[PDB]
Design a protein around this nucleic acid. Structure first.
Ligand SMILES: [K+]
Ligand SMILES: [K+]
Ligand SMILES: [Mg+2]
Ligand SMILES: [Mg+2]
Ligand SMILES: [Mg+2]
Ligand SMILES: [Mg+2]
Ligand SMILES: [Mg+2]
Ligand SMILES: [Mg+2]
Ligand SMILES: [Mg+2]
Ligand SMILES: [Mg+2]
Ligand SMILES: [Mg+2]
Ligand SMILES: [Mg+2]
Ligand SMILES: [Mg+2]
Ligand SMILES: [Mg+2]
Ligand SMILES: [Mg+2]
Ligand SMILES: [Mg+2]
Lengths: 118, 239, 50
RNA sequence: UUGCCCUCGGCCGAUCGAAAGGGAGUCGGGUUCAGAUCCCCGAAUCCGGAGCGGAGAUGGGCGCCGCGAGGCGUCCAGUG
RNA sequence: GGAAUGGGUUCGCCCCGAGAGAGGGGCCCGUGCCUUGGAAAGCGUCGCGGUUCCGGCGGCGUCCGGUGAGCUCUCGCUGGCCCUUGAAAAUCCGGGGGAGAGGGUGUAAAUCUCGCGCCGGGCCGUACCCAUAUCCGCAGCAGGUCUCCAAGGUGAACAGC
RNA sequence: GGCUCUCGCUUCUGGCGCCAAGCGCCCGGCCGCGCGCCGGCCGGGCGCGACCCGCUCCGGGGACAGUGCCAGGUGGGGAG
């Protein structure tokens, strides 16, 4: 019953966690940004061609919401390939362009043929 | 005994070893609400409390109040669940024979200042018990005087919460006895005689008994030290 | 902005194991490493507080 | 890991405020029509998280066996 | 170790029985040089090919010295000036202390700021002009608009030529 | 011991100082124990240490200051 401090501090009180009687939302929101929304369409420009032929990297236009982890995960099991690196930029028209460099064993030219880029 | 053990006393002098963890309860910076209720208790002692409010400081002593509650326990108001039992039982049992048996409603305590005030005015209250800690005190500050005027004995008791427990509520400003059973008539009479001498018969001096007007311990101590100095002077004059 | 020097004076804290640094107006003559004493029972010396 | 309790905790003041202040750690060569310490090649590094070594640490005492070396028992050490 | 017969020393100072000089050593920086990187690459030059829009393939070379009140940057040392004394915080580290923790002689234990290995680093900006034509001034306006780099000659000199 | 006043432990030194020693109480567990006294070991809490009581944290003001509302003066500071 001894107070060894000249200061009175608010006692620590129990704080219960929420146990709602009803969820405020009936159902979880559907993930709008899925693998198909992440990848919009591959870029098929001369510069993108050089990237496919030389750097073994594919060029995609992707959702601006998506990040490198999502882009890598989307490309990985959309086209059933492995991805080594993802470099993203936002082009002046507001789109996000992703340079997706595949693993060395995968061939970008082969994958471009299956996609339909060339 | 191990020779390695030795005393290591600490010198708690000024400039010496760090002071111990002493009890600082006296010097704690309490919250505003704790300071407010404490300073209010002091203002009641410091200020001149008029006799109408001050008379509630005179409460029944411990053994009388315990005796009073012992009798009042026998006349506690029925709980709503207890009343429901009484009813179903009365309705079903009286259905078998003759339903029309009003008989007599047994005696019971009457609670609430409004119920008691009317009972006193009609002289139907044999004994009125008022809590001493009613706030606002206006609710009962007239009640001791009113009981005196109608000649009904009244006693002030410690704790509105104590009265509230009789009537199964949190608090109760006052309770009143109107009727008691045959065996409790003697027990009630002894209490009424003791209470009447304490409160009703003494009400002339209660009306003028001002309270408070007591200075705090430090100021009174300075006053006593000055009085000792004045006494030293009186002793020198005698010499 | 002040024409008078200030003295950083370090005292032990009475109630906690901790050093307390105090900024004093420097009385002329005090020097670094000098002990200064503050209290009712301190001695009448330059820099002491009484 | 979880809830409780004890112990200790001044957060002596939320928060915002610098693309010139403070602030870990990337450089060389090559490549485009236009990019680059950002791409490619090569060589590093910082920060964050959870295997193999190495260190800690293998010292001394006394008896016994053994040509000896070495081993055995047993006690005492060991945060370089 | 012990200095006056004072000595050491700078452009200037300044330093010394509170330890000069002299001898031996310790620490910090290390942007320089050599090495791993590394010559394989770059560059110069002379050739030979081709898929003639190849990071093409070869040969040889990429050397040896000097100088400085030079200039710029950088790092130190040492002063002067002030009634002017020239941020804070994030963040990181060392020490004092010693509550603890660790195993009983081992296939040791807690433990480890040593070496190596494994995994990861999300988001936004990044083009170009930056000005006698991409900015403001109604304009490709003699105005205005914050910086870094800075060769040879003459000469005191980012003067002028 | 009676009555009063004062005092409570720190002043050669540019060191250190917290997270209780010690005494006392009680509760235990474990292992022996010779069936009997209990002991050893391993601990846990507590009081003293650090006195008791008390109604404002301490100190300085103080029914003044101040504030609220009137009243008179001053008021090119400002307005017309
Ligand atoms: K900044
Ligand atoms: K005026
Ligand atoms: Mg980017
Ligand atoms: Mg901020
Ligand atoms: Mg900056
Ligand atoms: Mg460019
Ligand atoms: Mg070569
Ligand atoms: Mg220089
Ligand atoms: Mg240590
Ligand atoms: Mg650029
Ligand atoms: Mg112009
Ligand atoms: Mg101009
Ligand atoms: Mg305009
Ligand atoms: Mg020049
Ligand atoms: Mg010139
Ligand atoms: Mg005017």
């Amino acid at each position: 019953k001894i107070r060894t401090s000249p200061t009175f501090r608010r006692p620590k009180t129990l704080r219960l966690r929420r146990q709602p009687k009803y969820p405020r939302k009936s159902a979880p929101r559907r993930n709008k940004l899925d693998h198909y929304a992440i990848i919009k369409f591959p870029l098929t420009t001369e510069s993108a061609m050089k990237k496919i032929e030389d750097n073994n990297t594919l060029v995609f236009i992707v959702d601006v919401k998506a990040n490198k982890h999502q882009i890598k995960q989307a490309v990985k099991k959309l086209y059933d390939i492995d991805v080594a690196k993802v470099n993203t930029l936002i082009r002046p028209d507001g789109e996000k362009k992703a340079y997706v460099r595949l693993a060395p064993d995968y061939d970008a030219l082969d994958v471009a043929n299956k996609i339909g880029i060339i | 005994v191990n020779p390695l053990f030795e005393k290591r006393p600490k010198n708690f002098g000024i400039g010496q070893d760090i002071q111990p963890k002493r009890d600082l309860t006296r010097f704690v910076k309490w919250p505003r609400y704790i300071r407010l209720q404490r300073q209010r208790a002091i203002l009641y002692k410091r200020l001149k409390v008029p006799p109408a409010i001050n008379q509630f400081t005179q409460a029944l002593d411990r053994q009388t109040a315990t005796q009073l509650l012992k009798l009042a326990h026998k006349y506690r108001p029925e709980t709503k669940q207890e009343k429901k039992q009484r009813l179903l039982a009365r309705a079903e049992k009286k259905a078998a024979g003759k339903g029309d048996v009003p008989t007599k409603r047994p005696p019971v305590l009457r609670a609430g200042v409004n119920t008691v005030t009317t009972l006193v005015e009609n002289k139907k209250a044999q004994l009125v018990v008022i809590a001493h800690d009613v706030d606002p005190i206006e609710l009962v500050v007239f009640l001791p005087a009113l009981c005196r005027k109608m000649g009904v004995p009244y006693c002030i008791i410690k704790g509105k919460a104590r009265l509230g427990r009789l009537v199964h509520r949190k608090t109760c400003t006052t309770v009143a006895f109107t009727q008691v059973n045959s065996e409790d008539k003697g027990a009630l009479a002894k209490l009424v005689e003791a209470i009447r001498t304490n409160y009703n018969d003494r009400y002339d001096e209660i009306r003028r008994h001002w309270g408070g007007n007591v200075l705090g311990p430090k100021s009174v101590a300075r006053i006593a030290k000055l009085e000792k100095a004045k006494a030293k002077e009186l002793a020198t004059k005698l010499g | 902005g002040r024409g008078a020097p200030l003295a950083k004076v370090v005292f032990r804290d009475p109630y906690r194991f901790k050093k307390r640094t105090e900024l004093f107006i420097a009385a002329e003559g005090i020097h670094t490493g000098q002990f200064v004493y503050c209290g009712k029972k301190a001695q009448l010396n330059i820099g002491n507080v009484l």
